[PDB]
Symmetry: C5
Subunit: 340 residues, 5 copies
């Protein structure tokens, strides 16, 4: 045309440029956004419990206070247990590394082979040691420095729970159609709140069941593996499969094959019954994240929000999808994120 800079071109480019600026803003302010978001989600999870406890005619402030003391004591105790178990695992690591190393040496002389062993040696180093080394580093930096920030986060959660009673009056007194599209009678947090409550119930059930079954199969670190399964259950399909690995690795490299197969059968039973109780119990909607979008959101949020961004990705992407579902212009993106 006569001008090359079409006004629609300007709209597109301004939108993209300002989105880039916003993302660099979030990536830069991650150390607030992450604790605040996570505190918000924990508050959402714990609010039904506190509300029911109020239904037992218990003072609100008293209830939340005792609940927070319970939670913080449990976290401190769990940090101690994790420190002991983790150190034991660190000092026990290389023995079964060599135990699984030996079959590689056995299988190296394939008839009419052309490659070398040392590179596959490094790949095995990736398999047993290196992934264990990275998990070691991440978890140990957690138990080392986290207590400086876990306390802060719990404080934030306490304040949110305390102030919840006055919040409905504040939303009611403030129409502002954007905010009613975020969380009001036009429920766009009650959607995510229910999902979080149900998913956390399921994850607790899965973690406890896995821990109990592992104890029934007398494997070491049964509790840590149960915790890991619980934590990873939040990522819908990748998380459970990824969590099922380390126990299988331990049981196979220590005990053998038949028991490892039985343990994997146990995990399959767990994840199928909870592939068959999560959907029909409540949340028949089956909140619409296609597996691809789950993985992509995982990578995305974990890249800008940092590691814990990975843990809270899926709830956060659900939030974004719900918010853009009702916006007039953006409904296209919202249906793009959905599943069918």
């Amino acid at each position: 045309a006569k001008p090359i800079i079409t006004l629609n071109g300007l709209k597109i480019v301004i939108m993209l440029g300002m989105l880039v600026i916003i993302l660099c803003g979030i990536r830069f302010a991650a150390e607030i956004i992450v604790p605040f978001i996570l505190a918000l989600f924990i508050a959402v999870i714990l609010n039904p419990l506190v509300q029911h406890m109020v239904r037992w005619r218990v003072p609100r402030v008293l209830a939340v206070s005792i609940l927070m003391t319970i939670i913080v004591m449990a976290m401190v105790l769990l940090l101690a247990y994790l420190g002991s178990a983790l150190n034991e695992l660190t000092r026990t690591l290389p023995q079964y590394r060599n135990s699984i190393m030996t079959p590689l040496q056995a299988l190296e002389p394939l008839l009419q082979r052309v490659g070398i062993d040392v590179s596959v040696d490094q790949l095995a180093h990736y398999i047993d040691p290196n992934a264990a080394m990275t998990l070691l580093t991440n978890l140990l930096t957690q138990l080392s420095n986290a207590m400086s920030s876990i306390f802060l986060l719990l404080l934030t959660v306490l304040f949110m729970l305390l102030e919840v009673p006055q919040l409905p009056g504040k939303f009611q007194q403030m129409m502002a159609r954007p905010v009613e599209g975020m969380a009001a009678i036009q429920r766009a947090i009650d959607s995510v709140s229910h999902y979080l409550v149900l998913k956390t119930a399921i994850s607790i059930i899965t973690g406890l069941v896995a821990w109990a079954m592992l104890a029934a199969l007398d494997v070491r670190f049964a509790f840590v593996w149960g915790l890991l399964a619980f934590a990873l259950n939040y990522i819908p399909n990748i998380g459970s499969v990824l969590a099922a690995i380390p126990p299988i690795a331990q049981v196979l490299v220590f005990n053998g094959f038949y028991e490892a197969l039985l343990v994997l059968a146990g995990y399959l039973l767990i994840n199928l019954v909870f592939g068959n109780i999560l959907e029909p119990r409540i949340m028949g909607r089956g909140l619409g994240l296609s597996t691809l979008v789950v993985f992509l959101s995982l990578i995305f949020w974990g890249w800008l929000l940092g590691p814990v961004g990975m843990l809270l990705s899926v709830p956060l992407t659900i939030i974004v999808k719900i918010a853009l579902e009702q916006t007039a212009g953006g409904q296209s993106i919202a249906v793009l994120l959905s599943d069918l």
Copy 2:
């Protein structure tokens, strides 16, 4: 719709992008914004005093000059006293650290226990030493390098106090409805000014009372604890509770339990009477910051404006709330920050 980039979408994204830019601007220029804001608040605090001293028929410039000399001499003397007391505390620290360490060893052999001690050892390190170590570092960097900037800040305060007499003519001669919404007959600084004056009066009273009562209970560093209580009294509910801790820790770990309980009772008396004189004396408005918003503003301002941003957060959030209270579009946010 036919276009995905709705004009309202552009408005939202431009507003958010430009807010991100502004915040990165403030975070980047913190070393001016902080001293300037703090000098402004100190000038507001000291203006009534100077004005009353003028009412005693004292020259304005003379009055402010003598007052600033008084203030700077007091600050230098207090820095010296703080240096001596702080060094004494540093060299006295670990003894009662071990004194409180021993009961942990006593309580470790809980019947049917499963955890370890070393992690709880590190948690105690967090409790007595580490928090003391961080307070040590922060206060010592203050007394070390602050005198380069405290003098600058006092100079700024002096200039503001000097120029105040001509300011009303300048505001009067300049309608500019935004500025009258910031500070004019449409009072939006006289709101914050009165809050600061009253809160500082209360904080001085609390600090002096705590110092006197601690002296009546012959604890070491009674003056430093009084100063700390005064400084932390600015954060309404978190500050007093957080300030009440270190004296309780010292008295319990040195003397014992009954006297520590008496001291905590004294703090409760102080903070309840000033939970019962702050509101009814003057400022029946009880400037509307919900406790959650207080904590969030604390975290926010302390994150971008740096540490002293935490100290001046609450006045600053009050300023923002008042300014956005009367703006037509933004009144929703203003009611969101309020309390009920």
Copy 3:
């Protein structure tokens, strides 16, 4: 004119400023954009294969699963082979470096010469060692750290292939004229998809033919040179010429002149027949990138997207050209990128 800031001036400057912001956004988020784009292209390449395998009445998920296992095993094996061959080349390097060094000493005493040898010594260092040193460094950092990200990329490819079946319903259910200009009945990915499929077929043919012919001429690292020719065949005219060099260097510096000439004749035959089968077999369009634009896009993408950006430049520039071809305002740029 009366104002200097013409509105058209604002449009131009806003467009340019926001483009700069976007580019700094991509350059900053390269570690996602690159794996995601590359996974998208690999998925496009492999989709016809999986679809044909489905035509053999094979389950979709089963087909993609087995194909991905095949691919990952092949990559691991190839990494091992590359490690061995690369280490052998590293420890063999300097001998023929000196072998080609000696003719420089022979040719230094040109009659009536004026220069020195040491600078030309450094130029030869650039020729045989240094370029080999840089290739060494790049390839070795690949085989060293890549396995952390190659697995991630393959995972992404697997997810895309898995979700493809539901995608057409999602595009169909979403008109949004921009998206139909990107990939719909208004084909702007089916254009790039076909180009990628055909170019990859040609590149595989070229790589295998070069490997076989080099084996027929019993040169060392025949397989590595075949792989390098395949990889560089993606850059249309520069890539093949640049890839033809290292084998010629090796054969000349080890064996001699006549055999090197025969090998170069073989490469000429390959690149002329595939300068004569690429065009007429299919893709009679001969996707319109003028050689200059090919080189410039190479430099550009390789500068912001990093090294692998160079490899995927040409497909990516084709994408941009196709997208801007149909846009009303930008068709000028699209014809500028074309060839005639």
Copy 4:
């Protein structure tokens, strides 16, 4: 209202965001902006001299050439003199540091004292050594590396002076109401030009008078103190007071009290007569910078433009005030910067 993002809100936020961007631009390009601005001011200062010398029927180019040679030779000689005197001061420093240290020890045993001496020892270290140490560092980095850039700046000044004759034709031939508001018949540089000329005349007079009087009181570094007084005379009220200190310190710590009082009386005489000749001689306007705004502009410009930004702050703020004085929208800010 129905939308929260009021259009006025967008205007405010866009203005602030773009101002932040501009300031980050200037802060980033300081190493050009500062020499260019300073060269412009020096050219303005020297233009009347060159023009008068032309009135003596001297060739323009010849006049400016000889004047620039004079200036550069004087700067080189002054750098040498400064190097010698500065090194002498550096090696003489600590003796009178201890001389003034001893009275602190004498005054430490105040009756009924509570503090320590070591912190006040560090405060004295701030007083005599540290401020001298910082002045040492700044001046020495000047005399060390400045000659690389002083020559560049003088070159720029020479070019501006050379090209001035053709400039009026260029402004005349270019209406562009913004530029006539910057410098034209609507004088907004002739305002600053006259201020600079008069202030520099006054500063030269003050520097020479102080140097002569100090020589009459046979103090060491009389010339350096005269230079420092001249340089600091540019900041209207803070500068002279700050410059009067180091000579007083030297004379008191070496000689004693009565002579120091006489010297301070001499400075008071100088600064009162030039608080009584600057205003009435010419520039009865008394360019309107309230002392607070002087100090704030000092801090501001010195923060973004770097140290020499402090020296050229006041002229620069005068420029900004004059420019925004006549702009229709911004006249409010202009009256805000003024004095009354």
Copy 5:
């Protein structure tokens, strides 16, 4: 007015903010912009030669190929010659440094002197050694690492020359009034192209003449000084004067005064005849850069585009001036850059 944020204010601030963004974009992407721009200019220079060679009925591709081989061989040989000569100069440096040092010692005892020698010693260190040291560093980093990028740049030049034949069809087929204002029948590159061709012819003549005359005066590094004169001839008035210095320094410090005066007379003859052949031969326009603007553009471009930005500044500023000459709004800036 009622609003302070005038719409014109927004236009000004948006223009300035986006210009700052663009400049930070160029400063950030300098390592592409510089080689691309420089390759474009070299292609423009060499295009007439190739076109004339085509007029001799020589194949276009063959002609450009042989010309590029010639150029690259000449560059490699010149790099070698430069390495040898530069190393010789480095190891010869300090002897005449001391030779010129001794007259400073002779001239130190000026009657009734007050300064010291050591600072003037450092100034002489600036004169003979330091400037030589900086030139050493810059040139040596060139001959060291440049060959990695010089080859790249020559490749770019080759591609541009190759593709030129099809370019006129592409511009013809694309009206887009902006592009015709950049380079079309509305010539705004044919303006710069002719300037570059003529200026390069003049610079070659000057370099060769200076080299020949220096050889006639048997000074060392006559060729290097000729090259330096050629390179600096691109900056119109500063460049020749700055280039004339090092030969004068060498001849004076080695040989003496009369021969140095003769050499300076030779340079004056050269630069006056080419101050008297450049203008009247062709380019009677005398492309309008006032000397001040030349210097300012030098500083500017050299600051953002880096060192070689200084070399290509003047052509680049000419380009900008020509482009903004015909734009309706910006013609004011274009006349501001001109000369009269």
